[PDB]
Design a protein around this ligand. Structure first.
Ligand SMILES: Nc1ncnc2c1ncn2[C@@H]1O[C@H](COP(=O)(O)OP(=O)(O)OP(=O)(O)O)[C@@H](O)[C@H]1O
Length: 447
DNA sequence: GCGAAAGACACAGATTTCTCCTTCGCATATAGGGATGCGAAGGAGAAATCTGTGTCTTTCGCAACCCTAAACC
RNA sequence: GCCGGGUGAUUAGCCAGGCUUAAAUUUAUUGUCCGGUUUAG
């Protein structure tokens, strides 16, 4: 996060070196026109784009029930299996704790995050403090972070390590400063308290990508904003459906009708030539513009993408519609041959509706430049995936989650043997309780 | 080890709104009188949301340094 | 078998292309003007 006389050493191509070369070039040139076209910025952007977010390893010492262990996480999927009271939620809490400081530093530097509560330290007599360590590896680049808290009543101090995460956050802020539509990583957490929001604002107008960074946890009001966001998309599509798109539509149907008329009357060149020429010319002219750059128009495509994505997980339904009533809007489904309502669904269908809708909203908001926003990077944590699901749905949820979002790392903890029948052996970790050296401890043995 | 300037953590309490609780007023299907059932407002008393204050965490461009080359702390 | 590490030797030489060898899931070369170590004047 500073400028240097560009120490040389051996030659390499690390992202850090490109970061410091751009900073060195910054202190000389003042005009922004040269800066926006310099080859150093192109090198930095190209290097940053091909890197894939990935948490490498984690270690927990003397936190809650866990005394000491180290875990290695896969880059696409990992599942923790155990019984009650075996510290399944402890690991997810530790990961969210270390991920909050990175979340905080992106919005503004030197901003605090989340600490350790005084009741989370172990209750043993011989303990003195608790610590958490982590590591993030983007391509060659490696960063580390340590969070620690001393037991209340002690007279010896311990502090945190925060140089790596501040250095990493500075790169993201610098890139965002010179790129119009730079993307950001995704971090989310679905705790066990998501069943309360199962169908239980001064005219919000401006939408930005920094509103999804308010919190790392999905809770309470996020459902309400989803509804407000969805109707905004619908109105945007309606505006695109009208105006000049209707003019070419007016020609096209008439040309088709004229061709149909030419087909009739015993085929009357002449009429056929005129109809064919007019149809070809109008269609070619309309298609040439293609609303600027085809998929660049978004509008209708995004709304259909989110609707079809939601309908992917509920095969028993037909369509979902938004209807304006006398004084409020409604969401109408159709199951079988009867129209339903969002408040007349079962608990299980509501859970899937909220989970998928929130995930799609976050992915769409954080990647405004990608043609298909559902291919972004990030990490998602889910606890007790088998809530309010019958065994038929328990065996196919996992492969669908990884099928729809193929570039997101997943961490999942489960409770039942139904899901274990559909997971590879390389991404299964089993917790156990054994006594070593006269002291009880927890181990993970399934590499 | 830690300047100034903003957040996190823990504990109160206050307040508007909603919801439970009398009191009687129709009503209507059984020829008037009596009975079971439900609708209408006051008047509670409960509960989610917000706001207040007091205790610590991070970590400075911090009177006061040498001018030959490489590595480590 | 695959991959990831070691490096003597070659090349208008921090390229490039050749020949060897090593293994539980298991390194990512760091602080000067002080300190001791190497060289030189
Ligand atoms: N401070 C503590 N000292 C000792 N043990 C603790 C402490 N805090 C929690 N525990 C232990 O944690 C155990 C439960 O841990 P945890 O909630 O992580 O497990 P889980 O049942 O797998 O999780 P979940 O049901 O929330 O998904 C309890 O049995 C308790 O003994």
């Amino acid at each position: 996060m500073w400028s240097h006389p560009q120490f040389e050493k051996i030659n390499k191509m690390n992202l850090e070196t490109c970061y410091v070369d751009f900073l060195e070039l910054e202190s000389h040139v003042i005009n922004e026109d040269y800066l926006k076209e310099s080859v150093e910025l192109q090198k930095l952007i190209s290097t940053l784009n091909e890197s894939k977010f990935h948490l490498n390893k984690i270690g927990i010492h003397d936190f809650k029930r866990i005394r000491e262990l180290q875990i290695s996480l896969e880059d696409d999927l990992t599942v923790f299996v155990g019984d009650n009271g075996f510290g399944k939620s402890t690991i997810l809490d530790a990961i969210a704790i270390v991920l909050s400081w990175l979340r905080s530093n992106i919005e503004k530097e030197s901003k605090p995050g989340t600490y350790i509560k005084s009741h989370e330290v172990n209750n043993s007599v011989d303990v003195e403090y608790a610590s958490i360590d982590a590591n993030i590896k983007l391509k060659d680049f490696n960063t580390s972070i340590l969070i620690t808290k001393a037991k209340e009543g002690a007279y010896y101090s311990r502090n945190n390590e925060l140089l790596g995460v501040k250095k990493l956050a500075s790169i993201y802020r610098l890139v965002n400063k010179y790129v119009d539509n730079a993307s950001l990583p995704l971090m989310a957490y679905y705790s066990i308290a998501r069943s309360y929001i199962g169908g239980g604002a001064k005219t919000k107008t401006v939408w930005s990508k920094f509103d999804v960074y308010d919190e790392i946890e999905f809770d309470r009001n996020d459902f309400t904003d989803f509804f407000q966001w969805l109707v905004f998309l619908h109105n945007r599509a309606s505006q695109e459906k009208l105006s000049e798109s209707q003019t070419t539509i007016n020609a096209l149907f008439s040309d088709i009708q004229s061709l149909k008329a030419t087909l009739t009357q015993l085929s009357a060149s002449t009429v056929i030539k005129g109809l064919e020429l007019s149809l070809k010319e109008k269609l070619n002219y309309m298609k040439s513009l293609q609303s600027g750059e085809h998929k660049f128009n978004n509008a209708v495509s995004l709304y259909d993408s989110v609707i079809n994505t939601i309908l992917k997980f509920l095969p028993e339904f037909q369509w979902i519609k938004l209807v304006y009533g006398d004084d409020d809007y409604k969401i109408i489904l159709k199951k079988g041959e009867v129209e339903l309502d969002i408040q007349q669904l079962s608990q299980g269908e509501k859970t899937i509706f909220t989970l998928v809708g929130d995930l799609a909203r976050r992915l769409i908001l954080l990647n405004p430049n990608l043609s298909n926003p559902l291919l972004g990077y990030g990490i998602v944590l889910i606890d007790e995936i088998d809530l309010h699901l019958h065994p038929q749905w328990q065996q196919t949820i996992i492969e669908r989650l990884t099928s729809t979002f193929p570039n997101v790392q997943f961490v999942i903890t489960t409770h039942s043997p139904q899901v274990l029948s559909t997971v590879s052996s390389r991404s299964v970790r089993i917790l156990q309780e054994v006594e070593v050296d006269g002291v009880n401890d927890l181990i993970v043995s399934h590499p």
